[model samples]
Target chain A: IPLTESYCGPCPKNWICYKNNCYQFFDESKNWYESQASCMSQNASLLKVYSKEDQDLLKLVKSYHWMGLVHIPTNGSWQWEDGSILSPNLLTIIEMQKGDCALYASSFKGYIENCSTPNTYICMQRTV
Target chain B: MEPHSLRYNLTVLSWDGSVQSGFLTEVHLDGQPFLRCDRQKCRAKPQGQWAEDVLGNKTWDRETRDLTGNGKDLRMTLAHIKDQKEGLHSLQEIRVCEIHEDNSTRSSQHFYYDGELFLSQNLETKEWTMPQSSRAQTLAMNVRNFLKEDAMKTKTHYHAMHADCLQELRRYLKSGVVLRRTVPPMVNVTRSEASEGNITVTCRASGFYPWNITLSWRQDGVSLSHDTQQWGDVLPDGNGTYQTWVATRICQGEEQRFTCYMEHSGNHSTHPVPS
Candidate 1:
């Protein structure tokens, strides 16, 4: 993400900004599909990350959540919710499966989610 | 009783591990500590009394620090140096820890380069808290300002210690008597006749303290030519000393004209000496 001192930028009251994106955490646990609906209801989406700094900052909440990565059954690999192919190298996960989602964890690299299990999540929308 | 007496010790060190050349990779010089003080470290520290030892030779007549907690053990450690426009010492990180009677740091007012980085633990909250206000900031700054003086004074002492250590180190390159002698090597030269008509002359030195002893062969008061010289591996003498020998084939008639020359620091020469 673009690093700047000008952060504390225009973000919603409870949110923080990174690289023109505003992000906030929701403590209520929701399954992968429900979490996306929650994000859309708030004019946001499961945080789509393009930088390690964003991953690091979001993980600080120590809240396990569904990030933007989803595994479509036809394709044997993962893709970001934005339809971008996140390089296989970028995903630090133990083993990938067809019905799995990406989970953000604090103090851990990251792990695969079962997609049906409930977990807390972060939501993000562009602020710039 | 009249001001008692105060002595100081100072050292310089590096940070980030990428220290510059000739700028002390790492040196900890705590020489024979015999002087007694009423503090914790004074009991069994290596106190050196050398006039020109590793730390500079200047010994202050008294310690001038007026520590405030009535009496408390004080320790100051400085790291990563800089200097001001007026030409004095500076530091990137310095911690002045005062050891209280219970051995807990009375105050660990450690300071980092950035102001916001000040750290303290809240006894009740059991968590680290930042300075709450300008009042809190003022106290932090005072702690820093007070430590600056003591750290700067220590810089001068270490600068002197660095100079003293350097001067004493240079003494190694100059020939002299050591404060305590480790060894004086024994030297020997011998010749053996071969049926093939050529005789071999060997020069050997043994039982020396410092390793870098110089040995050579001379014939008739003149240094021998390069092709006519041979050298042997330097070997330890097993008793904290060292020995080595070299041999060259020579004409039988040249035996009387050959002599071995040797020299070493501590001025051990090319002759058999009493250990």
Candidate 2:
């Protein structure tokens, strides 16, 4: 069955649903960590891209939605929330940029940018 | 001293299955001998005859009793019938005056009688009534304040460190070393409590480019024991940038002063060993 038949709620303007959750991409600015924390405060974490459908959905987002991957220098390893590497199989080769973490934007196709840039972005939460 | 002062540990379980360990001070029942736990009042009452082997642990049986006329607001009564095999019989009574509804998880209300525990029932619509205890209320308030303060301090420190690291990175960028890419920095310090003997200190600073940086430990304006830090696996930061770090543990005399110094592309900072 489809995850969600239709999107409903007072989602911020320009936001869309991917995988039964609402999201908006902020193209303007935000560092990766800052965006992640902002999302966390809203009971969500950074976006995790797993499929072409997911990528396509984010590609249409007009803003940027920070994903949950970052360079953790304390331990020389790329880690997710649960501290695991981003699986190579799930990532598109072109979307994988060394040193640049991935973020979803409303703009068609994702973009690679510095994590420290402050940008308006997406916020997601479970629908109660 | 009273001839019969009972001492026991009270395990309080909340409606949402949160368990708290505390000591019940003392208990008193109308015209009955006073019972005390942790030197506070707890009501003493007789246990009813009905017993059940809910857990099959044979060590103790759950017993219930109708403890009316105790001259105090009775909320709920649960008895821990001492195992005849263990030669102990103790009764635990939980009472509360008010229930606070928490909707985040399961709705739980605090029970306050001689001691405090959380009851799962919605007392407003249920027949349960917990007597109010001023001491439990004070304890709850103190705990809440302590937790709030701790959380605030932690958030403040975390953001402060993040800002400091960003500033330090900015300084490094100004120094001619092109920060081709920036990565998170690891900064931590270890301290020893002051005592009669020498105090040892250790600190660690690491992240990204270690070769472009220098790590050292100093004591009283002189260099102390140090080790050659090693680098770890290099991982790409998604944009052809690499991230790495190093760590070292140092020991010093109990009374000696020490510092961990980091020099990165001419930008330097030191963390003092807390006394």
Candidate 3:
């Protein structure tokens, strides 16, 4: 039997596929909330990864890309947009002193920044 | 079943017209880089904190020089494995072995000479698989001849290496890095109604580790399966855990009877769709 690679499923133009999800990386820089709104407009959400396989997203973090993670100083914990707490073992956040929003940076690690700071963003949508 | 793997990728680069050469080796465990040894460092160095804690910081400065066969240099081994033919300005050797929980192992080696695949072999068969190119075929014969003469030495060398790898794998497995800790998943169920009067229920299980999980839609506590249900693959959430979803189409007005139940790491939970 011939071994063939699994192809990406149907995704919107300009979006990349990994497994069953479609992801779009944007060059336009926007604050965290602004980026979230943009993704929501498209029936998508800022990228939220539940596993290490999505570290592929870090390859696109050439600069910094607004992800779905936000740091809650109240609980001194990080959470995904879906309200799930970030697993501490996944990726370490650098410069954790302050900042409510998290960005995947070229440093290949997470960086905490003010939610109002503009940055490139990524959107992910489950394939229909 | 999850299998563990140990891999060593070694590269030797030589200038087109000079005797100068650069050597580097990357040691990986389960697809992750664990240690590295390069000409600049000239010693095996752990790549991360976990590796350091498990493998220790003792440098192989002396062992590094011996690999060339001077003491036991790897460069010489690469040369020997590739048969050191002319026109070969670079060489790469990839050796890997996967050990399953039952102790069954699969091992292979591939050699690339001058950036082109020269030959590969399955450790079990000890047979050579060469590329279709005529040059490769010719090189394969030479390699076979070399192996015929050094067969015993090669076998002994690789036997020791594999044993070393298994020993190291066990060490890492005992460390906290591979403790197999379990994290319970957080599940949510949502319901959507189609215009044609069908209800689609989705159950998402996120933030779990180890990736082995089962999500199903149940009607009145009886598990529902078959064409009405679609299972999503378990995928990484980017940090360190996983997420997956299962959806099923149901009769309208019966949404309250459906529940999303999950079983993971020896525990079970239910997420009933919101009314």
Candidate 4:
């Protein structure tokens, strides 16, 4: 079924929605890990875009966010939730070099970024 | 007149981003009011803390201040109307108090109470009082009740999930299916029987994951006892994924029935086995 009407209106102040969840995007000054920890304080995880819906939601924004997906050279795989990867293909960064465990601002116009590069990112939690 | 415990239920929009609403219930004795927190561990901690100084003297570490502003143990207070049919009492004036830290730094702010809802704060005199509006009073009562109910619901949810998961696992076993590695289901006790010099009853499990499993009575649902026992296990497919199996056991004539259940990430299914 088309999931468009499931869309709630624009997120409230200091909040954004990705994958039917509300998130708070920190200023671009925070590194990927720092941004992730901030979201965790609110009982949420960093953004983990799993579907085209998530990609589309994030595409409209101008800034890049620090997503939960990170590369781990020790395992040669991207990991999430502090655990070894369960799905390798569910989320993959395009045109990104290996060993770069972070996601950066990539405008639909084709600008990519390094994970550690300071950038505003989003945080997500299940809505009430 | 003997003091009778009065309950006021209040609901407040949760600013903390929780799935449930927040509530705060307060009981009153004479003019003094007592507060009880229903939100998980709301009043679990002492309001503030104290420490000793190098000079063998005690000091007030305001940073760890209690809700009453006096650093006292956290407790609930009661609120009452001067007359049941009369309007609320009005306030004369409000003031703020200045607190001087040991380092000679001065900070001014109004004190807040733990259970009692404050209408406004005075920055000058540091005095705090409850407002005299019937609406405000009612709101406070409602908020308190909401918190109590929400907290209790959370506790119930936690227990129900365990029970439901166990029961569902049992049904999947009866249906010759295995369990999956998803979120567990919720279980609730329906009835029990203790007759014929012993106790024996049945349990119902709703919500199964992966659609297969067995329910059995192992010692506390783990190890097999001389009594009836059931077992459930999961097998993984080539995709590094797993399936589920559940088992249920009735110790014939034993007073209690053991159950197992399971569920996926986002489905609410109830599987109840008949007695």
Give the top-scoring candidate (lDDT): 3
- Model 4 / residue B185 / CA error / Å: 76
For A1-128, candidate 4 gives per-residue lDDT tens digits of: 77666665455556765555786767646766677777787778876655544556654453345667666668656666667463643442443222354543323221224556565566767566
Which residues of candidate 3, in runs, are more than 4 Å off?
A1-128, B14-20, B42-55, B59-90, B113-118, B124-135, B146-155, B174-177, B193-199, B220-227
- Candidate 2 lDDT score at position A116: 67
Residue-level lDDT for B9 in candidate 1? 30
> Better model by lDDT, 2 or 4?
2
lDDT of 3 by residue, A33-90 (tens): 9999999999899987666665555544444678898766678887887888877567
- TM-score each candidate: 0.30, 0.24, 0.52, 0.26
Minimal lDDT window, size 10, model 3 chain A: A54-63
- DockQ of candidate 1 (2 decimals): 0.01
Alpha-carbon deviation at B21 in model 4, angstroms: 52
Worst 10 residues of 1 chain B by lDDT: B61-70
Q: Chain B TM-score, candidate 4?
A: 0.18
Q: How many clashes in each candidate? A: 12, 52, 17, 79
Candidates sorted by lDDT, descending order?
3, 1, 2, 4
| DockQ, computed on Cα atoms, for candidate 2 | 0.01
lDDT of 2 by residue, A25-124 (tens): 5454577778888778866666655455645655433323466755566775455655667665554222323345555433332344467655456656
Which candidate ranks first by TM-score, i.e. highest? 3
**B1-275 per-residue lDDT for model 2 (tens digits):** 01111112232222222222332433322112223333123332232111232322221111111122111111112221111232222223332221113311111123332233422223223322332656444434443344345323222222222222233223323442232333434656665543545343545554444335455666565655535433344554553334443333344453245566766655677767655
**Once model 4 is optimally superposed onto the true structure by TM-score, how far is the C-alpha of residue B112 displaced, in angstroms?**
66
TM-score (chain A only) for the predictions, listed in order: 0.78, 0.56, 0.84, 0.63
lDDT at position B201, candidate 2: 50
TM-score, candidate 4, is: 0.26
